[PDB]
Design a binder for this molecule. Structure first.
Ligand code: HEA
Ligand code: HEA
Ligand SMILES: CCCCC/C=C/C/C=C/C/C=C/C/C=C\CCCC(=O)O[C@H](COC(=O)CCCCCCCCCCCCCCCCC)COP(=O)(O)OCCN
Ligand SMILES: CCCCCC/C=C/CCCCCCCCCC(=O)O[C@H](COC(=O)CCCCCCCCCCCCCCC)COP(=O)(O)OC[C@@H](O)CO
Ligand SMILES: CCCCCCCCCCO[C@@H]1O[C@H](CO)[C@@H](O[C@H]2O[C@H](CO)[C@@H](O)[C@H](O)[C@H]2O)[C@H](O)[C@H]1O
Ligand code: CUA
Ligand SMILES: [O-][O-]
Ligand SMILES: [Cu+2]
Ligand SMILES: [Mg+2]
Ligand code: NA
Ligand code: NA
Ligand SMILES: [Zn+2]
Lengths: 84, 46, 227, 58, 98, 259, 73, 49, 79, 43, 105, 144, 514
């Protein structure tokens, strides 16, 4: 592809700045907007004690040995199910 | 600067052949003895 | 089984092991021929006072050095690959037997009809009966019908093992979560021994395999009596 | 900010025989000594830990 | 769109980097960055080998594309010859860094 | 007195302190994993940081302040950095191999399907797409920074480099948030294993690369770079492009194709 | 009393090489023949001869009577 | 002038060979090493059952 | 059709050394068939072939673990 | 290669000593361990 | 490349250069002995007369020794070469290594 | 004459059969009579004595070809000493058998081996070539 | 001064010396381990204990011999000493990073010794396969200590590789192309490329083993949908290029030794030697699953791995025949280094050829995990990599030290080793064909006679190793100082004398373009 833009005359900082503010940052702003639209907690699924999940072959070296490092009580059940 | 030349470009002295014999003996001998003593260590546990 | 002072492969008990022996003889001949030619040429290079130390032109001779070995490799690969695909060909087995590796023994499952399964452990050296083989005998042999295509399925319930019977040319790794397949056909009745062939911890040396090959009718009666 | 690279080039090119890791002055020596002390002490402590771990505590 | 504030090498390069840059500008090569160009290498027209001492190692690639390099010390004084191809080299000692 | 252009380095204690820091980190991890203690690990991490700090400090002293980086030296550093990046690509390649291995032949324990039964992948169109735009954008701003530096424009170099760093930090905070929010964990079978270990090492590389960019930012503030000589900047930009490209492969492979 | 004849003076090493490489070749074919006769053919004939009139039931009966089997007494 | 090998070569060869042969023969035959040779042509088979 | 079943025949879908998916697929097929039959009032006897095949091929411990997991509600394949 | 005569010649006697000491340094510790194996095992 | 005669002529010419210097004498002999051959008498004759012009008796004797050496186990070559060189040896007063006792181990 | 370590960068003397004319003379310093000899060498070599010719050779070269190519008795020392150390190794094996190894398993007892050999023959271990093939089942003995 | 020089070094010769000392010490450790192996197997029954102690010994033996003896000696030792001298460079590109590559090795070795001291050791095989190496079947710190030891050795060699590639590409005289650098230099740059590409994949695989053991990942655990066979792929993807890493610098030293003691100015067929080494390096990356012919892979995959592995014989054959063509017409000097190289050419050839036997997946079904594999790899390691190391060591010892060895003693040493290694490993082919498995502490009685002879062979090797220490002592004790070295015009590393000054090529060589 030639992408869809134009340009090339010579080369420079001015063009990359143009690209930074005229395309890259607007793209980030659009994805940021898109993301803020679909945020807000989802409807956590029924707990099923599947044996291929919530693996424990050795206690974790922190906490009570049974919580993952970035344990989120809302959405990460223990081997025995969600917390109270 | 540093010493240069035979016997001087090494981290161990070769000034005296008998002191060198002792050092080489401790050096190679410790390497060779270590597995026997680790074996002994593992047998004398359980 | 191996016998004292054995140099080569155990006698073939299956047609595929027989093929492996002739392919090995073929390959070993080439091995002997090359290693002896190298030794000879070395000695030739070293046994003269005549000298020639100026620059030597290389390209004529590098043709021979690449083409001859290329030819020799094809002469090895051709029978190697025929045998490989022969081993892979469709069988129609009459029977399926499973073996599960464990620390440190093998279990066997013959579940085509009935639920027959049992454990097979090495006979401890202090319990061998006179004439029995140290580290090779088991309490419960893997009785199988001779002259019949058998599908062996191999897995493990713990660590890796490997199920091997050299005289049938067999070696299939025993991997937990995996069902590996091989086929077994014995041309003869008798007792055929193998040993665990993947390191598996403290008693790796001491979990052997004994196949007992007998006529179908004896196998069926044995099967029935093991339920 | 002003460009003071010239002053630093004078400092680090001073003909005083110091190796580059000590050539900034007395705080280089302090940082060096802290690093080496932590490294050497830490290594002895690791050896103590191996000694400890080499024997049963059950 | 655009101003300054970034030093140039001319303003700020120092030490050996600066010596190499200043020498290159004068087409000189005190730090041996370039391969010397051969003379005909006869006795009358020897390859001239600079040195800051009274001997330097020469490697002679006798013919184009030889993979073998012929190495020998070249000493101050009369021209020496490569032991393989005979091409002449003469040492021209001294100084460096103006 | 030398008449070649290469750098004879002053005898240095940092290789030894670095090597000992590796011993303390690895014996420290062992102690943490098996003997319930973080002490050795903390010491190792500290001496490691100290070693890195002093060693690269010295490289700056040798180059900016002492002038040892002739073109021949810089050329070696270019090769060194390219080879280092190649080794890091191969390290990632082992985790992509692991991911494709498990996802292309999902085992019966998983339900024989991918994603495994009970795994609810993140929506690749939400935060992961945002992260993709963020790193791609930072690839653009770093290129702007490089050109400003070559053109001798201090203010715009600093602006563009600051934007690049901000984007690195944004990615890191977004990723930290999505780790916390993710309904699956690193103990959720081979799905969680490949996901967190691959994106986790990538995240570490983002943090390393951001740190390298921040070092460049402060060196720029102090006028270390000339419009022609700024290898630390080029090396950080190359590493930063490497981190972007690894992200794009993770996004396509794990978040999108593996969803 | 008599002069010595001019001997060959050039290519002595090359001549020696050529002669012996040819000799190495001759020996190689000679050994391949030995081997196909003494090892490979011997093996094919031992197996073919063994199986030619082999009676597997009779083999089994001998083994059974010797008491070797768990499943057959 | 005769070197070490001119003066001691013959004795080193003879006594090295004698010692080597003697001590390997002794080791191989006199100290209870079980070589486990083939029974073929050697062992008389005996009833085991 | 095929009574005098001896063992599971070659299946061109699983022609290789790794037979894990053969055991798995036949186990699934049996239980899917059984569900389809026990439901619509029909006869599980029509599921028989899959039952013979998975019984022949599958390690006892696998069948037994899968059976426990179905009972528990933790079986991850779709039946 | 050519070389100077030894600056500190090592006589046959000195060589017997260096060789004996060298062999003993390998043999004695391993020998002590293997000799005491049963002690360690049947312990 | 070149015939045997052309090679020999090259080498005769090389040593026959009237003002050949010591360096060229050594270079010629040290290169020549690298080849798979014992030099023809006419080449050795030219090298020996170069030794004469350079007032170097010892190198003449050495050249005779290297002829013997290049023959290896072919014991018939050296006595033939000496035979062919006798008029030159007589003319220049060059004693052979054997005449000087220099063939004794 | 005397070669110094500090001389490594200078052209040096070698006795090599494939480098017959080394870069320097073996002896470069000349006595009064050796200088007179070098002068005489500028005249007809027919006027040099045998001793003078030998002397000129020995100024130019250290060893003759015959001396430099001579064989030695070294092989004797090498082979003899190697067999000694090999012999010494058997002492280590004797020490090991005596002090380290215990009894081997009871299955190597002579009667056990006779029975096992028979049982191997009953099961026709390696009946095509390896083992039972060498037993004569008709004459009840090892094949001759 | 001592610490500045030996702990803070930025000098390629001194760092090379450090590596040689470290490698020599590791060699004693590896040798003791090899003796414990053969003492266990030297009579039927149990000597030490069951397979756990036994395989801790086997595993340590391999790791010590490979990572702490062969690689440090070849690459760290000879590479550091020789590569900068052979290209007229003033040092390595990254002289201070070079020092860290060295200093990572004692901690790596310490970690390996720790693994064997704690719990019951890591009795896994040097391949460290799960699940045996997992947290259930090898609970506790041992295996994690082993993984960390490998991590440090891996970083050491990766940074070394970057250093060597950069040095060799960037620091040659400006007139010298890559096709004017000596074969040993080529051998090291190719080895460094292999290291750069292969070690990071090892690092990924053992990291995933570490996380399965400690963070509840399940890369290799079927219960989480993982696969033990995945581990084997990642390991061998490294492990095959690793054996080319172990032999390539050996090939390089062999080329120099054979050229040198043949009185030649150059190896036969230089560009074919370069081609052969690059082709071997390349083919070495696409054959790894010949270590997995029994795991249950598809037949076409086994056909491909058989064929691709066998192709390696062609470029390797060019090198063997080019070594023979280098001898051809030589003024042969029967130095002890030459005996090592000649033994190398022949015994390496035999080991390569049994490698070709094993490449055939059909035959490998019966040979795999048997002593036939052990016999193959010891012909190429104990009589290939090791013979090249001994050849290089005796050849360059006078350069490194300024002193000569006693050549008679060195020849005696070669003779004893040659008998011992062949007595050790030759009968192991018979044990393999007849079915003796790997990693057994004891064997059925039929295998006794070959195991006895093999163990007696290992004692003869022990005697050679002890004699080697004495020979090095005697050289330093007697102080015979080097005077003249021949063939300096084509062996630049000798041109600065013995030992060369601390700083060499402060003034670079002069080389004309023309
Ligand atoms: C230095 C180490 C080294 C080297 C160089 C090699 C070189 C080769 N190896 Fe080896 N090998 C090992 C060390 C090495 N090996 C180790 C350690 C293992 C075991 C790993 C473990 O499980 O622990 C192993 C295992 C191993 C296996 C696995 C067997 C098994 O586990 O069942 C195989 C299978 O293909 C293999 C093959 C080869 C081949 C084809 C070569 C080739 O590169 C050899 C090529 C050389 C020649 C062929 C000789 C010279 C050639 C000629 C003279 C030309 C003419 C020749 C012909 C026409 C054939 N090797
Ligand atoms: C370089 C690698 C290397 C080397 C040299 C050796 C050398 C030896 N090995 Fe090695 N071995 C392996 C690598 C090596 N081994 C590997 C990879 C395995 C597989 C591990 C596994 O299964 O997991 C193995 C397995 C293995 C087994 C199989 C164990 C089993 O399956 O149960 C056996 C048994 O006999 C054995 C024995 C020996 C012996 C007797 C030697 C002797 O030849 C040793 C004799 C001594 C030396 C060769 C000298 C040592 C060198 C020095 C002292 C250097 C000095 C240097 C300077 C001064 C510069 N080894
Ligand atoms: C944007 C995030 C950036 C990462 C920063 C986060 C902190 C942890 C560090 C991660 C760095 C990456 C290393 C890879 C190891 C695994 C961690 C993966 C990333 C991660 O952070 O994974 C977390 C688990 O971390 C865990 O176990 C904790 C693990 C911490 C222990 C580290 C283990 C040490 C591994 C050493 C490997 C050696 C390196 C190899 C060297 C190669 C040399 C050649 C995920 O959390 P969770 O609760 O399971 O799920 C979320 C549920 N809401
Ligand atoms: C919890 C675990 C701990 C993890 C550790 C965290 C790590 C953070 C480290 C971040 C990296 C910072 C690197 C700073 C380097 C600054 C020195 C520098 O950049 O030095 C430059 C040379 O480049 C050079 O060495 C380039 C040097 C290359 C540096 C490479 C950086 C990446 C290495 C990181 C380690 C990766 C770990 C992998 C994990 C699997 C100096 O030359 P110039 O710039 O041309 O200047 C000269 C001009 O002024 C002349 O006019
Ligand atoms: C695998 C490599 C090594 C294998 C070869 C080893 C050869 C052995 C060399 C000698 O080793 C010594 O042997 C002695 C016995 O000869 C032991 O003394 C033991 O036996 C003596 C007599 O029974 C007592 O006096 C001592 O106290 C008692 O320690 C001694 O401890 C041990 O060091
Ligand atoms: Cu089971 Cu080895
Ligand atoms: O690996 O061969
Ligand atoms: Cu391989
Ligand atoms: Mg295996
Ligand atoms: Na730039
Ligand atoms: Na044993
Ligand atoms: Zn030249």
């Amino acid at each position: 592809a030639s992408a869809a833009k134009g340009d090339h005359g010579g080369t420079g900082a001015r063009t990359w700045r143009f690209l930074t503010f005229g395309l890259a940052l607007p793209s980030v702003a659009l994805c940021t907007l898109n993301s803020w639209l679909h945020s807000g907690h989802r409807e956590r699924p029924a707990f099923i004690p599947y044996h291929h999940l919530r693996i424990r072959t050795k206690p974790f070296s922190w906490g009570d040995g049974n919580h993952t490092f970035f344990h989120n009580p809302r959405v990460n059940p223990l081997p025995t199910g969600y917390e109270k | 600067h540093y010493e240069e030349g035979p016997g001087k470009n090494i981290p161990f002295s070769v000034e005296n052949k008998w002191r060198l014999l002792a050092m080489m003996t401790l050096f190679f001998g410790s390497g060779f003895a270590a597995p026997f003593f680790i074996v002994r260590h593992q047998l004398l546990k359980k | 089984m191996a016998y004292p002072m054995q140099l080569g492969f155990q006698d073939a008990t299956s047609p595929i092991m027989e093929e492996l022996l002739h392919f090995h003889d073929h390959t070993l001949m080439i091995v002997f021929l090359i290693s002896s030619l190298v030794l000879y040429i070395i000695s030739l290079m070293l046994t003269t006072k005549l000298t020639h130390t100026s620059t030597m032109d290389a390209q004529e001779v590098e043709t021979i050095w690449t083409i001859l070995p290329a030819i020799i490799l094809i002469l090895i690969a051709l029978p190697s690959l025929r045998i490989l695909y022969m081993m892979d060909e469709i069988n129609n087995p009459s029977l399926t037997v499973k073996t599960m590796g464990h620390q440190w023994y093998w279990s066997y499952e013959y579940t085509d009809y009935e639920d027959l399964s049992f454990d097979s452990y090495m006979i401890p050296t202090s319990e061998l009966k006179p004439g029995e083989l140290r580290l090779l005998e088991v309490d419960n042999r893997v009785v199988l019908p001779m002259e019949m295509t058998i599908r062996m399925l191999v897995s493990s319930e713990d660590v890796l093992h490997s199920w091997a019977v050299p005289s049938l040319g067999l070696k299939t790794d025993a991997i937990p979560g995996r069902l590996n397949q091989t086929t077994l056909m014995s041309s003869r009745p008798g007792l055929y021994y193998g040993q665990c062939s993947e390191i598996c911890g403290s008693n790796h040396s001491f979990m052997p395999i004994v196949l007992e090959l007998v006529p179908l009718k004896y196998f069926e009666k044995w099967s029935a009596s093991m339920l | 900010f002003e460009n003071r690279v010239a002053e630093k080039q004078k400092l680090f090119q001073e003909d005083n025989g110091l190796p580059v890791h000590l050539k900034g002055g007395a705080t280089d020596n302090i940082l060096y000594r802290v690093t080496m002390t932590l490294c050497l002490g830490g290594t002895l402590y690791s050896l103590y830990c191996l000694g400890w771990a080499s024997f049963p505590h059950k | 769109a655009s101003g300054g504030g970034v030093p140039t090498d001319e303003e700020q390069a120092t030490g050996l980097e600066r010596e190499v840059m200043l020498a290159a500008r004068k087409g000189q090569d005190p730090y041996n960055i370039l391969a010397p160009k051969a003379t005909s290498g006869t006795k009358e027209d020897p390859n001239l080998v600079p040195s800051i001492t009274n001997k330097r190692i020469v490697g002679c690639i006798c013919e184009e594309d030889n993979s073998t390099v012929i190495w020998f010390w070249l000493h101050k004084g009369e021209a020496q010859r490569c032991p393989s191809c005979g091409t002449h080299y003469k040492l021209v000692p001294h100084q460096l860094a103006h | 007195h030398q008449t070649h252009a290469y750098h004879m380095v002053n005898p240095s204690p940092w290789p030894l302190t670095g090597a000992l820091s590796a011993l303390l980190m690895t014996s420290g991890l062992t102690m943490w994993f098996h003997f319930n203690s973080m002490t050795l690990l903390m010491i190792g991490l500290t001496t490691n940081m100290l070693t890195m700090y002093q060693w690269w400090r010295d490289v700056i002293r040798e180059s900016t302040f002492q002038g040892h980086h002739t073109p021949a030296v810089q050329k070696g550093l270019r090769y060194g950095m390219i080879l280092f990046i190649i080794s890091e690509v191969l390290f990632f390649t082992g985790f992509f191999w692991a991911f494709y291995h498990s996802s292309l032949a999902p085992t019966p324990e998983l339900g024989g399907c991918w994603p495994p039964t009970g795994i609810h992948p993140l929506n690749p169109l939400e935060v992961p797409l945002l992260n993709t735009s963020v790193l791609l954008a930072s690839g653009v701003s770093i290129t702007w920074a490089h050109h400003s530096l070559m053109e001798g424009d201090r203010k715009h170099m600093l602006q563009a480099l600051f934007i690049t760093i901000t984007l690195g930090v944004y990615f890191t905070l977004l990723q930290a948030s999505e780790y916390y929010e993710a309904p699956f964990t690193i103990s959720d079978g081979v799905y969680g294993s490949t996901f967190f270990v691959a994106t986790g090492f990538h995240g570490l590389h983002v943090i390393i690369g951001s740190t390298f960019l921040i070092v460049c930012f402060f060196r720029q503030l102090k006028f270390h770079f000339t419009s022609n000589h700024h290898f630390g900047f080029e090396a950080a930009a190359w590493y930063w492009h490497f981190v972007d490209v690894v992200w794009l492969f993770l996004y396509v492979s794990i978040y999108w194709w593996g969803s | 009393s008599t002069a010595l004849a001019k001997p060959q003076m050039r290519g002595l090493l090359a001549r020696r090489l050529r002669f012996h490489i040819v000799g190495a070749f001759m020996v190689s074919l000679g050994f391949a023949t030995f081997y196909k006769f003494a090892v490979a053919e011997k093996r094919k004939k031992a197996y073919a001869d063994f199986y030619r009139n082999y009676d597997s039931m009779k083999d089994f009966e001998e083994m059974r009577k010797a008491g070797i089997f768990q499943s057959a007494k | 002038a005769p070197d070490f090998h001119d003066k001691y070569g013959n004795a080193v060869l003879a006594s090295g060979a004698t010692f080597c042969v003697a001590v390997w023969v002794y080791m191989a035959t006199q100290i209870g090493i079980e070589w486990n040779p083939s029974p073929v042509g050697r062992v008389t088979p005996k009833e085991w059952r | 059709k095929i009574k005098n079943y001896q063992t599971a025949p070659f299946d061109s879908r699983f022609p290789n050394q790794n037979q894990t998916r053969n055991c798995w697929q036949n186990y699934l097929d049996f239980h899917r068939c059984e569900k389809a039959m026990t439901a619509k009032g029909g006869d599980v006897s029509v599921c028989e072939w899959y039952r013979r095949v998975y019984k022949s091929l599958c390690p006892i411990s696998w069948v037994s673990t899968w059976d426990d997991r179905r009972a528990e509600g933790t079986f991850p394949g779709k039946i | 290669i050519t070389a100077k005569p030894a600056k500190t010649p090592t006589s046959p006697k000195e060589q017997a000593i260096g060789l004996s000491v060298t062999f003993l340094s390998f043999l004695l510790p391993a020998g002590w361990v293997l000799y005491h194996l049963d002690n360690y095992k049947k312990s | 490349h070149e015939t045997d005669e052309e090679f020999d002529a090259r080498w005769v010419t090389y040593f026959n250069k009237p003002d050949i210097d010591a360096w060229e004498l050594r270079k010629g002999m040290n290169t020549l002995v690298g080849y798979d051959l014992v030099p023809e008498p006419k080449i050795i004759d030219a090298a020996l007369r170069a030794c004469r012009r350079l007032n170097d008796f010892a190198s003449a004797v050495r050249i005779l020794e290297v002829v013997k050496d290049k023959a290896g186990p072919h014991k018939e070559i050296y006595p033939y070469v000496i035979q062919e060189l006798r008029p030159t040896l007589n003319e220049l007063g060059i004693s052979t290594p054997e005449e000087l006792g220099l063939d004794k181990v | 004459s005397v070669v110094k370590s500090e001389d490594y960068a200078l052209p040096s003397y070698v006795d090599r059969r494939d480098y017959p004319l080394p870069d320097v003379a073996h002896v470069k310093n000349l006595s009064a009579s050796q200088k007179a000899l070098k002068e005489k060498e500028k005249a007809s070599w027919s006027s040099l004595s045998i001793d003078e010719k030998v002397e000129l050779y020995r100024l130019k070269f250290k060893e003759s070809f015959a001396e430099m190519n001579r064989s030695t008795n070294e092989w004797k020392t090498v082979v003899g000493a190697a067999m000694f150390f090999i012999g010494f190794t058997a002492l280590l094996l004797i020490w090991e058998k005596h002090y380290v190894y215990g009894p081997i398993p009871h299955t190597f007892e002579e009667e056990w081996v006779a029975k096992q050999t028979k049982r191997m023959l009953d099961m026709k271990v390696a009946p095509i070539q390896g083992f039972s093939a060498k037993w004569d089942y008709d004459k009840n003995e090892w094949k001759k | 001064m001592f610490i500045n020089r030996w702990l803070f070094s930025t000098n390629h010769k001194d760092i090379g010396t450090l590596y040689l000392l470290f490698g020599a010490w590791a060699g004693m450790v590896g040798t003791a381990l090899s003796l414990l192996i053969r003492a266990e197997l030297g009579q039927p029954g149990t000597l030490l204990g069951d397979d756990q102690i036994y395989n801790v010994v086997v595993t340590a033996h391999a790791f010590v011999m490979i990572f702490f003896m062969v690689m440090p000696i070849m690459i760290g030792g000879f590479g550091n000493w020789l590569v900068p001298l052979m290209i007229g460079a003033p040092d390595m590109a990254f002289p201070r990073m070079n020092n860290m590559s060295f200093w990572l090795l004692p901690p790596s070795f310490l970690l390996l010794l720790a693994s064997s001291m704690v719990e019951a050791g890591a009795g896994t095989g040097w391949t460290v396969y799960p699940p045996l190496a997992g947290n259930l079947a090898h609970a506790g710190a041992s295996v994690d200590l082993t993984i960390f030891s490998l991590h440090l050795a891996g970083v050491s060699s990766i940074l070394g590789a970057i250093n060597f590639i950069t040095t060799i590409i960037n620091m040659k005289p400006p007139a010298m192309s890559q096709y004017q650098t000596p074969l040993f230099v080529w051998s090291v740059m190719i080895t460094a490329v292999l290291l750069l590409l292969s070690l990071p994949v090892l690092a990924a695989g053992i990291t995933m083993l570490l996380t399965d053991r400690n963070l509840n990942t399940t890369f290799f655990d079927p219960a989480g949908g993982g696969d033990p066979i995945l581990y084997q792929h990642l390991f061998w993807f490294f492990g095959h290029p690793e054996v080319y890493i172990l032999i390539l610098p050996g090939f390089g030293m062999i080329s120099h030794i054979v050229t040198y003691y043949s009185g030649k100015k150059e190896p036969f067929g230089y560009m074919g030697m370069v081609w052969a080494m690059m082709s071997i390096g390349f083919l070495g990356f696409i054959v790894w699953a010949h270590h997995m012919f029994t795991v249950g892979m598809d037949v076409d995959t086994r056909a491909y791995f058989t064929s691709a592995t066998m192709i390696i014989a062609i470029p390797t054959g060019v090198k063997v025949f080019s070594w023979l063509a280098t001898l051809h017409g030589g003024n042969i000097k029967w130095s002890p280094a030459m005996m090592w190289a000649l033994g190398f050419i022949f015994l390496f050839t035999v080991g390569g050829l049994t490698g070709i036997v094993l490449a055939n997946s059909s035959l490998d079904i019966v040979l795999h995990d048997t002593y036939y594999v052990v016999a193959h790899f010891h012909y190429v390691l104990s009589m290939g990599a090791v013979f090249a190391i001994m050849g290089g060591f005796v050849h360059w010892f006078p350069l490194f030290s300024g002193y000569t060895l006693n050549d008679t003693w060195a020849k005696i040493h070669f003779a004893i080793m040659f008998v011992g290694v062949n007595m050790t490993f030759f009968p192991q082919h018979f044990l393999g064909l007849s079915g003796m498995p790997r990693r057994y502490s004891d064997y059925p009685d039929a295998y006794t006679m070959w195991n006895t002879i093999s163990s007696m062979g290992s004692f003869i090797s022990l005697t050679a190793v002890m004699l080697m220490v004495f020979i090095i002592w005697e050289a330093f004790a007697s102080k015979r100082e080097v005077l003249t070295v021949d063939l300096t015009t084509t062996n630049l590393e000798w041109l600065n004398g013995c030992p060369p000054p601390y700083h060499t090529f402060e003034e670079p060589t002069y080389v004309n373009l023309k």
